[PDB]
Write a protein that binds this ligand. Structure first.
Ligand SMILES: [Zn+2]
Ligand SMILES: [Zn+2]
Lengths: 360, 360
């Protein structure tokens, strides 16, 4: 038997936690990195993405709405059938890409509201559904940030009720709420209280990674994450670089997603424990070592820097495929070392060792 | 203005010759190697084959008859349009693959005769047409070899007349006759006299490279090639390994074709000036040198043994493409060094240097 959504914390160190989310389509090890998915020849195969270590992938609701459309994905059997991925899928609400009519009802651009966003995510058949919120701009006036937070909370309630109105969705999926409030601690507290009063399966910290820089993002995390319910997962959306991830786990974040491994891989850039490298650099043309000396991904078991350099410089799509697979696998190995070090009570030392070497 | 078929000898050394065949679709430098073509994603691009140095490619009439068929190729505009190759094309008669009813009329298996073979080659629109002959088996009884030679000469006359009956073919293409007679000098002489009496644009030495070994092939060439008209091209069909080619040029052969560069490339084997190599061998996994140290093909300008080794071992089709391109380019560079050394009167020394190093 498998539960709808069950978060268990197995070990803690400071604010960091490691554990599992059990869902009907599988178990998610936390802290978790979710690669951002696309349709299943122009992308990695889903078995390849699974083999990198990913327990869950993300679907971009806005892009799926535009092509091929949510009703079409439903007729094809849902997003799992469409993507060839049978493990859990999280979908965002589509609201951020709308920004990236505009009344309290929702927006038209296609129409999106709390109710329509929840309905589209049900048509996709995703396992974790994000509430529809309003993104405060960056930077945000204290006036504008107060406005978008309060609208987001009324929309979070509407998301809650829309989700609960479909037995098939409410019995089989989970719903996450999104805290807003920008850099204003009192707003963040009001937002957290509102979401906790409504009740969600997990809570995301919104309004971050939108240009504010890491020091400010960390300062906001420092007081925002403790406000959320301790016994539910904490999600930092769209983050990020490896050092962003490590420091966010130090501050209590359990879940992450980012296109960065894919964007980097397509641009000829590989993540390594010694920092990112540009594989086109001449120093790699005769380098017989793998992309990363310690990475145990399938690419680093077989391919040298020299030969990936050759593929990338020739514009062979295989080069970008190999880079992307390694980058996503590197991210999963980072999450695994994070999980292991929390379990063994040496995560704070892991983070310091990681930073000293990554920025050396 | 461009002539139908004009063979000019520019320089000689012993029995070896170098020169040009001018045809309406281009000039063929001799001695020439003709790669064996196929349809134009599962093959090298025709611009790639041209860039290796090939002046003319071969079409396999029997395979083209079976798929998509000669009438279909004609409706598509002919073999040049079908293959994306606008330079000269030679077609064989289809008769050897028939072996590899059977009366004096021809054969049924589809039907092939001197007349039908010439007609199919006209439908293909090829520039050099081979007469239809009868292949004596290997090894051949002195009885069987006498029979197949004499039938071939009657069929050579029928080929001549069929070709001459179509103004469009006779004014724009050329026709080659094929000497037969197996290892019997008197038969070879009878065959040569018959073909010279009929008259052809060029003459092939048939019945060789069918299992007899190089020493016997060379012994037959020694007396067979001098029997053919000196002022027309001499063609040794389906030959062969680099050392076969060098020794055949020493004996007066001007033209060659072989699937060997392609078959080798698909099997992970590369020709080099130091002999062929099996790129899968472990010694190449860290070898940063190109396939051949002196080859100036596009592959050796960019790719290392190590990375082609990696591609081949992974089963990436790019690996086989690169190997095949290099092998066909290596063959063209061999022909160019042959042509250059004859022009400079140092071909006999070239051949000895070539053998000492290729078999070292
Ligand atoms: Zn790797
Ligand atoms: Zn080469």
């Amino acid at each position: 038997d498998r539960p709808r959504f069950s978060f268990s914390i197995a070990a803690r160190e400071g604010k960091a936690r490691t554990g599992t989310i059990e869902m009907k389509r599988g178990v998610i090890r936390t802290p978790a990195f979710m690669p951002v998915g696309t349709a299943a020849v122009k992308a990695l195969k889903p078995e390849t993405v699974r083999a990198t270590g990913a327990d869950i992938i993300l679907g971009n609701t806005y892009h799926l709405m535009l092509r091929p459309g949510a009703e079409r994905i439903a007729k094809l059997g849902g997003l799992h059938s469409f993507m060839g991925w049978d493990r859990p899928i999280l979908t965002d609400s589509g609201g951020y890409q709308v920004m990236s009519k505009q009344s309290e009802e929702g927006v038209t651009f296609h129409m999106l509201s709390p109710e329509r966003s929840i309905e589209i995510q049900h048509l996709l058949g995703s396992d974790i559904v994000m509430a529809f919120d309003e993104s405060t701009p960056y930077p945000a006036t204290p006036s504008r940030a107060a406005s978008s937070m309060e609208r987001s909370m009324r929309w979070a309630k509407r998301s809650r009720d829309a989700f609960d109105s479909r037995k098939e969705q409410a019995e089989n999926a989970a719903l996450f709420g999104i805290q807003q409030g920008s850099v204003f601690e009192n707003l963040r507290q009001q937002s957290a209280d509102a979401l906790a009063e409504i009740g969600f399966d997990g809570y995301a910290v919104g309004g971050l990674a939108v240009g504010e820089g890491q020091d400010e993002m960390f300062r906001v995390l420092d007081f925002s994450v403790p406000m959320l319910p301790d016994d539910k997962p904490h999600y930092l959306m769209g983050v990020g670089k490896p050092d962003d991830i490590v420091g966010a786990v130090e501050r209590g974040i359990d879940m992450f997603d980012s296109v960065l491994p894919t964007r980097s891989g397509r641009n000829g850039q590989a993540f390594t424990w010694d920092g990112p490298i540009n594989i086109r650099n001449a120093r790699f043309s005769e380098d017989l070592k793998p992309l990363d000396s310690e990475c145990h991904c399938a690419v680093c078991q077989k391919w040298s820097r020299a030969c990936i350099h050759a593929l990338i410089r020739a514009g062979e799509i295989l080069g970008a495929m190999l880079m992307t697979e390694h980058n996503i696998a590197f991210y999963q190995q980072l999450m695994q070392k994070i999980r292991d070090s929390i379990s063994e009570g040496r995560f704070s030392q892991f983070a310091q060792d990681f930073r000293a070497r990554y920025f050396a």
